[PDB]
Amino acid sequence: IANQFNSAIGKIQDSLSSTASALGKLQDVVNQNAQALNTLVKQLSSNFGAISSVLNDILARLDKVEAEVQIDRLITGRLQSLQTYVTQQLIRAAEIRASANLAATKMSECVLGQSKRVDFCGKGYHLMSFPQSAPHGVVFLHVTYVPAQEKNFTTAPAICHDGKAHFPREGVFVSNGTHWFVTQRNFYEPQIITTHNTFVSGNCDVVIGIVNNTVYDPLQPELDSFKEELDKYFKNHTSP
């Protein structure tokens, strides 16, 4: 588990250092803000249907009663250009807020805790996550348990023993093809079907797909060994 984790951290380190595009969601936010600021400054070169885009060159050519009408055009067009920028900034800022509230929720639920929510802390089952800072952003390194190489098995919903039906306390009944076992669902670790691994409920006629197999009792030998010794003691006590 350590050697897998220490390798997976090494693949993150290499990947970020190797490819261009991995920072895309942050570089995009830098590029949109640069593009919008650049666009806002370029609008100052625009005439807006006035005689010129240079405010001092209007004033240096026309007299005041009509130089005002040209300046009013530039005021209208530049005020419209700020309003376009601020509307773009507000709509973007609402997006970044949504992404910051998601990031805060990921910090709270994947870093300060372990999440049972599927996909919310990466693919697999969430073990833990580690935060890393980035320019204007957060990176989460989500660590997950992923089921690897699998094997198919025969299975049953219940086991029948003394005409009573038996069900797993945790996990699932599986056969290797000849013998029956009980195992935890998320990792193959077979165990003998005991009275301590299972609970009884009702009789074998009600359950579709129930199978016959023995259920082991762990206490039965701890009284039968004690019984065979007790009988040997009675045998010895015939001798005096």
Binding site: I9, L141, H142, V143, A148, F153, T154, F187
Partner: protein, 40 residues
């Protein structure tokens, strides 16, 4: 020989699941994995 091709996109590998009324698959092993996620 390189040229631009145009095609209907496939959605992924097709994979008929080996379902049966009494068959289960259980992992004999696991991979720990680290995925980066990046948020503004």
């Amino acid at each position: 020989s390189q040229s631009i091709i145009a095609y209907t996109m496939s959605l992924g590998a097709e994979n008929s699941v080996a379902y049966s009324n009494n068959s289960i698959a259980i992992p004999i092993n696991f991979t720990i994995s680290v995925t980066t996620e990046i948020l503004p």
